[PDB]
Amino acid sequence: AKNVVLDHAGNLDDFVAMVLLASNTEKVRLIGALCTDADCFVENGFNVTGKIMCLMHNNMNLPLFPIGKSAATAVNPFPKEWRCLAKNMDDMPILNIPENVELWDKIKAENEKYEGQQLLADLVMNSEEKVTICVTGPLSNVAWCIDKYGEKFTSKVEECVIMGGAVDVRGNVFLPSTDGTAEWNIYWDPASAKTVFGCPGLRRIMFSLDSTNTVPVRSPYVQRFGEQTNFLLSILVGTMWAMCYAWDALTAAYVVDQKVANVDPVPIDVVVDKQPNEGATVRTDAENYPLTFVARNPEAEFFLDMLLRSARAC
Amino acid sequence: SAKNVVLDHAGNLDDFVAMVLLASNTEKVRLIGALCTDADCFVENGFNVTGKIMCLMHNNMNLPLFPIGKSAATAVNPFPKEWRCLAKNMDDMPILNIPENVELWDKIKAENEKYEGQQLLADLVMNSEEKVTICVTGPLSNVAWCIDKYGEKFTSKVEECVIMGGAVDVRGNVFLPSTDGTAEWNIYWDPASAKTVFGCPGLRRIMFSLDSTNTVPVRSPYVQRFGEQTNFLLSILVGTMWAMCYAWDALTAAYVVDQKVANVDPVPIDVVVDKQPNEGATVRTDAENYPLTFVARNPEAEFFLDMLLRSARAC
Ligand SMILES: Nc1nccc2c1ncn2[C@@H]1O[C@H](CO)[C@@H](O)[C@H]1O
Ligand SMILES: Nc1nccc2c1ncn2[C@@H]1O[C@H](CO)[C@@H](O)[C@H]1O
Ligand SMILES: [Ca+2]
Ligand SMILES: [Ca+2]
Numbered sequence A: 001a002k003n004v005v006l007d008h009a010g011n012l013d014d015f016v017a018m019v020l021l022a023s024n025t026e027k028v029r030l031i032g033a034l035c036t037d038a039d040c041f042v043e044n045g046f047n048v049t050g051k052i053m054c055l056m057h058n059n060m061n062l063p064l065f066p067i068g069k070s071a072a073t074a075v076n077p078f079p080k081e082w083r084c085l086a087k088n089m090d091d092m093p094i095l096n097i098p099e100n101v102e103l104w105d106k107i108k109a110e111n112e113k114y115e116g117q118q119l120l121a122d123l124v125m126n127s128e129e130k131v132t133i134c135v136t137g138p139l140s141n142v143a144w145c146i147d148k149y150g151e152k153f154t155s156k157v158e159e160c161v162i163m164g165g166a167v168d169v170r171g172n173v174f175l176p177s178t179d180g181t182a183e184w185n186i187y188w189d190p191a192s193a194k195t196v197f198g199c200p201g202l203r204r205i206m207f208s209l210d211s212t213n214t215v216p217v218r219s220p221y222v223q224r225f226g227e228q229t230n231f232l233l234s235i236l237v238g239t240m241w242a243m244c245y246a247w248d249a250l251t252a253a254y255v256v257d258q259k260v261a262n263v264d265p266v267p268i269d270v271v272v273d274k275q276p277n278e279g280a281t282v283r284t285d286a287e288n289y290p291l292t293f294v295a296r297n298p299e300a301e302f303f304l305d306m307l308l309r310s311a312r313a314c
Numbered sequence B: 001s002a003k004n005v006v007l008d009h010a011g012n013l014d015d016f017v018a019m020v021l022l023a024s025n026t027e028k029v030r031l032i033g034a035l036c037t038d039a040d041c042f043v044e045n046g047f048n049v050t051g052k053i054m055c056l057m058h059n060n061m062n063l064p065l066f067p068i069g070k071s072a073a074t075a076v077n078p079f080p081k082e083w084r085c086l087a088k089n090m091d092d093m094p095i096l097n098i099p100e101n102v103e104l105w106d107k108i109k110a111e112n113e114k115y116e117g118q119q120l121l122a123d124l125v126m127n128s129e130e131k132v133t134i135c136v137t138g139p140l141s142n143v144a145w146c147i148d149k150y151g152e153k154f155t156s157k158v159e160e161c162v163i164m165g166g167a168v169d170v171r172g173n174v175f176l177p178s179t180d181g182t183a184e185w186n187i188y189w190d191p192a193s194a195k196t197v198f199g200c201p202g203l204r205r206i207m208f209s210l211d212s213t214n215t216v217p218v219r220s221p222y223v224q225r226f227g228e229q230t231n232f233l234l235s236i237l238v239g240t241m242w243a244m245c246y247a248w249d250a251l252t253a254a255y256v257v258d259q260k261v262a263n264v265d266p267v268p269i270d271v272v273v274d275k276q277p278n279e280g281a282t283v284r285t286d287a288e289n290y291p292l293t294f295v296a297r298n299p300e301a302e303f304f305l306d307m308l309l310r311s312a313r314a315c
């Protein structure tokens, strides 16, 4: 098992990624998670992270891990539209089974004392072995760590598996002020993304929309979790995916098993200018620019099977 | 003991909570049928969710199967929506996709597919031995269609219509550039049908308008209490649906289950049908001898909340 820290934005797929990571203890040792008040009010995201962790901890061999609320603030907020859906998960019956909430309530205080970014920095730097950061939300936190600790931080990162950007496909940020070339996580904080993608000595695996677009949330598959209602994770996963792509889940799946996707190096830069394409992750020919390993043609079935099986961990 | 009920719904989250309330209370309600209207949510999804909930309950609490029909009703005022926080989603909810339940649904889906919902409402009501209570949680298009088509032959077989809709003394919830916000969505979706129903003499109507439904909001701590009943499919179902959310329709269904949910006051209700800012508003009319509608007032919130929590333990 390799150390993994989940740096997420608290949206539905962030939690599916969390489930994926957490449930695969053979491959992943989830030593921490941080939630950014991005796709949600860090509040609900933080709580759901904890409720999921506790549900898992009380039902399978998943060690408790610190959970930090990131202090990162958006450059460009996620649409209020979806965004705060963690609020809705916070209230799902599956995440409010008494023994689990009882645990969360007991360990909540210890977690409330963490500042997400510093926790990310500490978890990575103080780990004996290198840490794989699964970033399913904006890059504000990994960027903060780099800005603050440079190499002391990046050298301790096995690799940063990032869900974000759109390299050779359209983005998904369609607003009156944008040209749709940017992807949401990058668009949330382009500057931090620039820092991360341009950081040499930081191995980055990038699950841009190029790969995530090829593995959409399909009804028949989601209904298969109904075949596993005896498993809490299936009720959990099935329920989340049954709400308004497996972006983050795909990203986390890779962390569990890189067979999820081949990756090809691409020098990725980010447009941080308040321009229509703000947040666009673009190929750059600038010499010696750091390479990012963009996932390509993910193994949809492999991933879909992985998720279904992982959803049986408990 | 148990009275015949037909649920005429719109397939949103509370329509289903309403269905669970009706279906789960077999001592008081014999659910003999349901129809889904393509209002709030895509009727096919509402149809499937209704079937899946029905079969889940058939298999787990012996809920007798009943016909489910999709209404052909088309909106007068389309929900600018798409933001239907249910039906589609719900159809993929794992608790509703348990094989034995889905298998049963698949076995009876074809037959239900053949029903045109409005005609079904008419037949269920008219061919029933005892009177039928129609719990309408969606627009009134189907009750109106039956009234217009069969008149007295239909209404005389209705025990009463317990309707979720309208706003009498409070603001509505239809806030569009062209509206004044005094209309409530179920009525606004089809004002003429609503007018038809509210002005129909010899049709008893109980009306849960926003006046009463606003007093029972869906609160997180309450929704979270379903997490304490996860050994019950209905609590996973209800909790899950309310986790995505007022208890408009649930309240209305609750009243069908036990009228102590709310006292009702007779009000002559007309519906603004003209294309005015308040189109769809349910207003008191001074028309002489105009039919009375019994508007729910100050519902028993705790009674309702307890009822729903209890009902969600039916299985
Ligand atoms: N409906 C939606 N469209 C686009 C992005 C969305 C979304 N719901 C959540 N996101 C968030 O941003 C990232 C992908 O663009 C994912 O990490 C994701 O979780
Ligand atoms: N977000 C929302 N706003 C207004 C009405 C809504 C709604 N979601 C569902 N409705 C529906 O319409 C009626 C209350 O206006 C109820 O039947 C209800 O289920
Ligand atoms: Ca995310
Ligand atoms: Ca309704």
Ligand code: NI
Binding pocket: B044, B113
């Ligand atoms: Ni069909």
